[PDB]
């Protein structure tokens, strides 16, 4: 829907928490926008650089699994609500990789 919104700007999803945190593979969850959207692009990248990936999830997703993460570094998930016409604002939530469960447990 939407026929008179074509002036109308895409909204990005309110600030995704991150479920799980290991070394490889860090988990998000962003809540949609109000925009009626396309797609998502998840651009995932160390902030020291290293190993960097974009996923595409469905318009309807709210979650992405990151994998080939670098342990004990710092990633900036970036999420992108796509429409057919633009792209939303995007969100940046950065998550350390805390690496594999060492001693996990007192």
Known sequence: ???????????????????QVDDTSIVVRWSRPQAPITG???VYSPSVEGSSTELNLPETANSVTLSDLQPGVQYN???YAVEENQ???????????TGTPRSDGT
């Open 1 to 19: 829907g939407s026929h008179m919104g074509t002036t109308t700007a895409p909204d990005a999803p309110p600030d995704p928490t991150v479920d």
């Open 40 to 42: 998502y692009r998840i």
């Open 77 to 79: 998930i970036t999420i």
């Open 87 to 97: 792209e939303s604002t995007p969100v940046v939530i950065q998550q350390e990789t």
